[PDB]
Write an enzyme that holds these catalytic residues in place. Structure first.
Site, mmCIF file in Angstrom:
data_model
loop_
_atom_site.group_PDB
_atom_site.id
_atom_site.type_symbol
_atom_site.label_atom_id
_atom_site.label_comp_id
_atom_site.label_asym_id
_atom_site.label_seq_id
_atom_site.Cartn_x
_atom_site.Cartn_y
_atom_site.Cartn_z
ATOM 1 C CE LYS A 57 -3.932 -2.610 2.063
ATOM 2 N NZ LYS A 57 -4.846 -2.552 3.253
ATOM 3 C CG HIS A 88 -4.618 -6.699 -0.583
ATOM 4 N ND1 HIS A 88 -5.763 -6.792 -0.021
ATOM 5 C CD2 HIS A 88 -4.427 -7.657 -1.613
ATOM 6 C CE1 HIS A 88 -6.442 -7.815 -0.895
ATOM 7 N NE2 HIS A 88 -5.714 -8.190 -1.845
ATOM 8 C CE1 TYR A 94 -9.769 -2.567 -0.795
ATOM 9 C CE2 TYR A 94 -9.054 -0.796 -2.194
ATOM 10 C CZ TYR A 94 -8.930 -1.448 -1.389
ATOM 11 O OH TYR A 94 -7.360 -1.893 -0.722
#
Lengths: 151, 151, 151, 151, 151, 151
Positions: F11, F117, F51
């Site tokens: 990230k 992630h 997402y």
């Protein structure tokens, strides 16, 4: 009074994957004392003696073949509860259950390539030390930081 | 908001064993902010006050003498939940139980020589900060990475 | 000549960029003994005394501004030729001329953001140590490894 | 070319100061093949043979003393120009002249406690290897990464 | 001047030998900014273009074959004097001449298996960046630590 | 089985805080194979697809903002049980629950700045790989150490 010893062997995969220094560093930094160390391709008969308790398992021939497929680094380490604590540091036998931070947790994937052996009891340790080392290969010295590691 | 703070002390054995850099690195790399730091030999009187809750225990004289037997590094670190999380990073107070990956897990063996202290509660933390440091020895500044560590 | 001392300061950028542990580790691992340490925002007045030989130079204002722009870690280190060897460890003043493996070589880029100061001579070390530390802040103790670092 | 070997011994100070893992990692990561390794207290006799070209020298009885004062890790490493290159990796004989990045530059201070020995020439290496090791202690295996280290 | 770019490629031997993390960490810790990165098996045509200056050399086919023999990590790094400083950090082309502390000095042995490439000039870097990357693969962002790396 | 793949993204915070090398090293040393890697600023549109399932949540805007605020390193890693094992390596989603030795445990503090992630299942992983990579970006090659990681 802190004289327990354990047998630790870096398996041929640990040697091949360039992990000898990393592994030894983990034992040194912890405070344990290196008592003995040698590097050899272990004979088949020696390895069968080592793993005598597994001799009737289906995986035993493959284990012996793998354990003979390159040189190992054989070691004895001394310290308070070195047997059980050494086992914690190595991580679970199967790298799958092995936690990050442990040797197997950090560095390997499959149980048949799990980079390191450590004694599973004091009795096993003393058998393994006798199997792999002549008595005179066990070096007696005092660590300079002993009184800072132990009360 | 003003973030939580914890008191961390590197004990005489951690200094002696050359672990000061390693330990600070673990706090820096986590994203905690160093608020204060000094190196000193804590006087027996200062240690009696630090351990005042233990003044009537049989081990107290020996503890104080030991803690006065070399210099400590005293530190204050800031961050969200730094008291509890700092304690996890240190590991269990008994190194025999501390997990690989933790400070005590990686670097020491026996509870009497367990290299490091961290506050066990926010209460204790503020008590310890006020005892070991003058309020002006606590430095205020914003970490360049603050907005990447905190939303 | 084994009682020589040098003054090492981690500059505000060295602190901001998370290099305090790394830096200390390099001194510890070399075998030098940490004598004193504190963490502070040095006052403009204090910094003008530290750089007093340069007070008439055009870059003086900017030098004091930089050194005051955040906290520093001030240290005293002891050992044989610690001044000269410590300087070599740091690298050259300009990080671009500092070799890989030196602190400045490994960790910074620009001369005005060059992370660390070390005394340039014994004369400057004695001056700087007095300026930044009271004698009672300098701890006298013997490294457990002393007899393995020194003949 | 690629089959050159050198003799490397970690001196009693390097063992005592917990540098064995550190040192082995440097040779591993470089791409050199560990051929032999053992851990031993070298006898006064053996050491006098090893240092026989200094028998008639002032510093001999105390050199042999230091080198017998603790165990050493004796090793044989293989690779292209490993003798010369191993020497560069160790640094200069005097740690004070050893560059940061080298084993002596990083880790030690004084010439009489200079942590490590390496062969000074190919002929010296073959002499040292035959003195310190049985021929059966030299293990022949192929590194999994050999073809990525060598054309 | 702080916006100079260089092209660095980890060669197939560097990827095979598990040095990608180590290499990137050296550039990150120095203060340089990662601008672009991708992992690929460079095509023969792409490689022949990259080595166009050497197209008439006897070794050119074998060179292209090697460089196509596994994936490479292609990168662009940004900072002050990054072309020259990156080169220094890598070491000399021939690992025999590369000093301990450099990437090649620490990790490889032979010129034909020298793990990494960096641009040798601004003009070379711009050519290599245009050949290896699409313009849109170079990402603009500002390091959180920029004001601590640069005046 | 041994050809399972997972998606790992470092990230924007992980990139900003200079943890790219550290992270990649942990995957390399474990014995996992790097299949694909790129470095980009993911658009709001790309992150909305990534997402998509969360599009109607109140936190969705700030999530996309954060994940677009800097570049990410997107990776595909291969190996036995790499989805689940990768997850363990990363630690729990909340750094407060992540154990020392894990990536999130060692390097970060808050759930909204949790540096990395990994796929939560094989289904998820293949979805993520299709989204983030073209198939021709996944590189097929064999690790020189494969036969020492796997039976």
């Amino acid at each position: 009074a802190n004289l327990e010893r354990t047998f630790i062997a870096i398996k041929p995969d640990g040697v091949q994957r360039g992990l000898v220094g990393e592994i030894i560093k983990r034992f040194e930094q912890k405070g344990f004392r290196l008592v003995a160390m040698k590097f050899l391709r272990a004979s088949e008969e020696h390895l069968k003696q080592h793993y005598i308790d597994l001799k009737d398992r289906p995986f035993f021939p493959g284990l012996v073949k793998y354990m003979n497929s390159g040189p190992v680094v054989a070691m004895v380490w001394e310290g308070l509860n070195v047997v059980k604590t050494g086992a914690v540091m190595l991580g679970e036998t199967n790298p799958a259950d092995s936690k990050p931070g442990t040797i197997r947790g950090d560095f390997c994937i499959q149980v048949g390539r799990n980079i390191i052996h450590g004694s599973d009891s004091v009795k096993s340790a003393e058998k393994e030390i006798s199997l792999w080392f002549k008595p005179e290969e066990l070096v007696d010295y005092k660590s300079c930081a002993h009184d800072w590691v132990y009360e």
